[model samples]
Target: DFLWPAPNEEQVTCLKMYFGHSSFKPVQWKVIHSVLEERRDNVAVMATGYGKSLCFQYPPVYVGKIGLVISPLISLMEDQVLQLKMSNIPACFLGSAQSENVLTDIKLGKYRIVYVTPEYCSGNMGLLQQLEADIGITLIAVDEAHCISDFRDSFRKLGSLKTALPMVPIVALTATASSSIREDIVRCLNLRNPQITCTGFDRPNLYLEVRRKTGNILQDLQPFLVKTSSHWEFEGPTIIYCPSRKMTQQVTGELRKLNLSCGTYHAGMSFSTRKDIHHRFVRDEIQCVIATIAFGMGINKADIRQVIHYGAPKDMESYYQEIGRAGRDGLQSSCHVLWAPADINLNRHLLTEIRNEKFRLYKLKMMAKMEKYLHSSRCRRQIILSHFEDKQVQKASLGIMGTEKCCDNCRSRLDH
Candidate 1:
């Protein structure tokens, strides 16, 4: 039987003093204890919007030392630092546009938490060495750790950090990871007997559906996007996840042709241009954002009513995370995936670039499993819960709103 470690009085006092939270979620308490008190490497696999950041953020407050956070994107770092500053926590991120003063402050140990991209961490080690020489770091936290498992070029280089800073305890946090992905993270990061905590991946408010794609994707998607004569009238913001940069542009154009007010985002665009669209979308200036996978992670806008995948994702982790963006406010929302047989072939062709045969085979198997989900007639909620090995499958599959609001298949079965 698993038992949660109780928080000490000093740790409990810091929780309120630093974060203003009177209590910690049981899972969060477990993660914070393993990282802060036990001084062990930890991997936290909680659901999206489960407050994974708090687990890492609390350790620096109690340890009275700087915590180095390696994030995947500039936007994520920016968002995190902004919130920390708002809460009166001294935090800064080293990006491409940092000034000389910022560097001096970092050397002077002016910040409690410093965020950097994996690219900067691996590519520019001189600054990190200087920081270590000047102030030293207490802990290393890797946000979106599953990307390391997915073998992203930038994240793969992060494995060397264990070799470079062996003594610093590392904590890897992500909303999604399968059994194999979990193993991959532990192996690649060289985590030493890390405390592994997976609080399950079930989000009951999201109604999952997979629609077969037709030649005309716009026609297939028209029903889901409610529109007035002048403009679109969405219950809340919507996201259409395209498979490629070109597809995001194409879909955005098609939606605009149908009088939908939307924006498109991809890595191909200039930083300023993408940033403008992101701000606009968050401010509710746009009804929808049609974007590649580059858009959704770490964006804090809740109440997203729809998450439409224009094409099938390469694996269940990507699919689950993308769809998890919807209904973050705990309101009922729909997640639709428009998939075709061609998507599997495209994913296979893309995987050809992977050099490692073993890793390549692992990716292919995940792709095959995603394809099966598209073809399966089983309860979508049940399949997703089972895939993540969630313990409350029976309870979550029924959902708070009953079967009709749970998933497309469950609703269809009721009619049958």
Candidate 2:
């Protein structure tokens, strides 16, 4: 039995007026109801652009105890806070942009929702403990929750969060997470029997392609770029992700030299410069952005036609999350990865310098798994879903299944 029946006419009107949406997507209404009325801890792994924000935002509007949203990126936090303010949610952020006085207001419980990084909250255990005591921290939302896993390439040092603020009902959210990563997140955060709601990982409209970089890599890409640019259907905004700042700059410079309207962005660039480029890309003034992994957090651009990775991501976790950025508008998007043997060697060398032998070995093992998947001839979607312990979705057997023909690698095998 559904706890809360479909939204009433008044609620629907409110949603449309505020979010500009006709109705809530499937499962979104359920999650929002659980958070607002039931006060249950949840782990939602919905696809990108599936309205995850509404789960927490709606609850705060109805029942308020100062929701704390711990996210990774400052820009993302700022954007979300701004949106909440526009919607009259009474939100603020405690991060690099603010001074120490921000904590004073937070201590006073002046705001209904506060967005801060895990580092900001956990960095000062005393402050977090004090806040927990003073404010009766009710709900803790961990965005991009998979980053808490030890197996993930993008793992953060957030183990202290459990100790700093214990026994708070938590909502863990992520678009990508395997079973291993999910278990690790639960253990790391000390979540108590969190309900896992997964919408699955089948993005049918996107084509996933992996090209091995051999001989003249630049020459190999030029033809694909020309074809994609000339094609009317494919001519939309694209994102090119490189592994490092230097590589991002090099790719951006090469594209500019060829008279393509592209820009470069990374953490190394000045904050204002990055913001300008991001605004330009969002407004469709720039055709492409050659950026590092740092660029994708909390980005809501719906019309991105392609996401090309110039180098292989450190592991499948990072890879899935990065490629997940494309095809957000439910349109036919393309994802390409150019992998090289030397890239693996470079990543292994970087791992070896981590100084923790156990962590280094774990990274090596994860890298091996990524390499195996990259070289395998099996269904790409099957391999990806299997990592998350999801039941194998038999797309090929189903004649009309969209995901069957969605993967370029699978289609290439059929062509052969």
Candidate 3:
């Protein structure tokens, strides 16, 4: 039933010409076929570095029309447009900075791919309708589609896109969406009979390691810290995600006591200050950057060697996405999570703020799973894969890469 057209000669040639990939990953081709050939709404749950962007990026060449991509972050939008332009793909993003030139170019049908914030799309449906009438929008892709369920503001208005542009096929893409979140996404987006393609949750290159915090932050992190600061220069950039803005600053200050080159980032920081820190971190001028959840999503750094969590994230979806930032280049990287029972209480307190009983209860269950995964002696990788209910876990008891490259739990058994 899911089987659709195989890649045609044009698609194969186009893939090579634009993306430089000789063959499509099965999931990528499946998603492309779903949207372009079957003309069906599709939801793809792939890992962070798993080429999710290519699903929408490929269609513009095959269909000879515009592919409107709605992204959550302006930084992410800007990054893609820049990457696409370098590939000689006609791509642009609509933002506040540009005055008339962007709209003028968009009206002339000059760009095949146009990235817009959800805010812009929800507010400017009339403008999009005009484009649909004029240039023919072949596909509407909602990247980070899970935001529809989690974020309240402009994301809730996204359901209207389906109603307004009924003819155009929509594709929802996210790195992590549990069964419940998947259902929520489908329901909220009003997708009809959407083809669901999940690429599984396992990232073989990322070595998972979690530890119960032992109160002494510096001493607890000594093993990892020694490796981080022992070298004269950065082995690779590291990110430490703390639970709060104050914690980020405190952690940065503490790391400085050890004479470690680092910086702090949070929403509370001035725009220019954050921009400067981000720029420095990316340039490898800073050995590590400690920040709250505000830091990771927009970053596309490929060679990050470590992602250390000083406290528990609200849920596994956030943790998975945050850890996914490491090993983006397919090299082996470490994700070390150091969290305490106190952190869990903070997460629970935040969950209690949710007004909807059902939604709050559902989130509580997710938080419970995160705690279970943290405390269990089970294979770390398997726990995460099974939480997402990925079928691949059924076939392999060990992990995607077997025991050798598996999590810290499996590696300990290997040592024993």
Candidate 4:
């Protein structure tokens, strides 16, 4: 039996005072304990709201060593480090854009936790080697670990962890991963006889709905906007994902023309523009954000009432991850996808950049699975899990109502 140790009274008191939580969440304790006492690697697959950071954060306080976290998104790294610093945790990061002093501090063990992009690890192999030699890294935490797989829709360089540093103890974290992806992550990170812990992916509170557009896209979305606009009436924020930068600007322009409080965000925008938009969105001046795939990773907004996909995502994994961003407050919320046939082709064209033929085919299959979800009448949960090769235990129905009704299309088919 693993039997991980619990946080000491003093540590518990500090946690309560600092984090404002009376006790750790069930899995949080287990993971934190294992890292601090057992000194073992962990792979935690909890839902979105789960406090995944505490697993690594709590341990560094006890271990008195640096926790190197390789994050996929730069915004997420900055946001988390800022929050941790506010709480008196000495955190920092080193990546392509950071000053040389950041790397120097990391080498001297001046920071307790260092969050960096995988690109940093693989891009500058010499710098990473120097840090490894000087600091003698104790733990390596990989955020969004699913990118390790060739099948993953958004693959990053961090997936080649073995090539960078093979001897470090790795703790991989992800909110979404199919069984196959999980195995691939383990292999890529070279976790030795690693223990796997999963919180399951069933988000019953979320009403999954897909709106098929037959005529003009904007005209089709109008009815949905009319029905659900009231949910955002109280100045609540919502995220609407567009497939391309052009779509993001066009959709945001249309929304602005309607006099709706909204903003646009994507990689194409300038850094200052993105910063301003993000600030306004967080400040509640903008009630909605129309963005490309770059918007959702490190978003901390808990009051997001709804998440609308203006176009289809690349795969079930990506879809589940994006939809996971909504309804985080546990209140009734909706995950609706507005689909068009061209979106699929566009997504497919984007995957062609992968030079590896096998990897490209795997991505294509994942995209097809995403399209299947749009066309399915079965339980949405079942369909999602099945893509991950998990067995569905129960059946569910889909409906368009903002509540618990089966999807309108599925219900219409049954009625006929």
Cα deviation of 134, candidate 4, in Å: 8.0
Cα lDDT listed for each candidate: 0.78, 0.70, 0.79, 0.69
TM-score versus the correct structure, for each prediction: 0.83, 0.82, 0.85, 0.81
- Candidate 1, residues 1-416, lDDT tens digits: the string is 16656788888898887788889888898888887777899988888767788887888867766788998776667657777887889999877789989878888988889998888888876776676667877788987787787457788888887777777788988665467678878887889999988887778888888888888967877778666666666656888889888888778778777777787766546545755776787788888888775343323467788888888888876788778777778888899888888887887899999889978998888888888888888677776776677333574444442378777887888879
Q: Residue-wise lDDT of candidate 3 within 73-184, one digit each (tens)?
A: 7665665776788889888888666769878988878899999988888988998899999988989998778777765557778989888999999999866546767888
List the candidate 3 regions with Cα displacement exceeding 4 Å: 1-6, 61-64, 86-90, 95-98, 149-153, 175-180, 226-235, 267-283, 294-298, 390-404
Model 4 earns a TM-score of 0.81
Q: Model 1: residues >4 Å from true position, as ranges?
A: 1-23, 61-64, 72-75, 95-100, 117-136, 144-149, 152-167, 174-184, 187-190, 227-231, 268-271, 294-299, 353-355, 390-402
Query: What are the per-residue Cα lDDT tens digits for candidate 4 across 1-416?
Result: 25655668977886786566788877888767665666577788887566787777766655556778887677667667767777877888677778888777777878778887776676766666676677756677887787666334333565555566665567899655467777778776767676677766666567677877666655745654543544423225778888877887777776765667887766545545665776777688877877675443324466677788988888777787777777767776777898888888888789998789988888888888888888876656667755443554445332232233444454555667
After the best TM-score superposition of candidate 3, give how far the Cα of residue 320 lies from its true spot, in angstroms.
0.8
Q: What is the lDDT of residue 145 in candidate 1?
A: 81
* lDDT per residue (tens digit) for residues 125-190 in model 2: 676677678775657788878767644433355566666666566788875546776787788777
Give the higher-TM-score candidate: 3 or 4: 3
Highest-scoring model, lDDT: 3
Off by over 4 Å in 4: 1-6, 96-100, 107-109, 119-138, 150-168, 175-179, 224-236, 268-275, 294-299, 352-354, 396-416
TM-score of 2: 0.82
**Candidate 2 CA-lDDT value:** 0.70
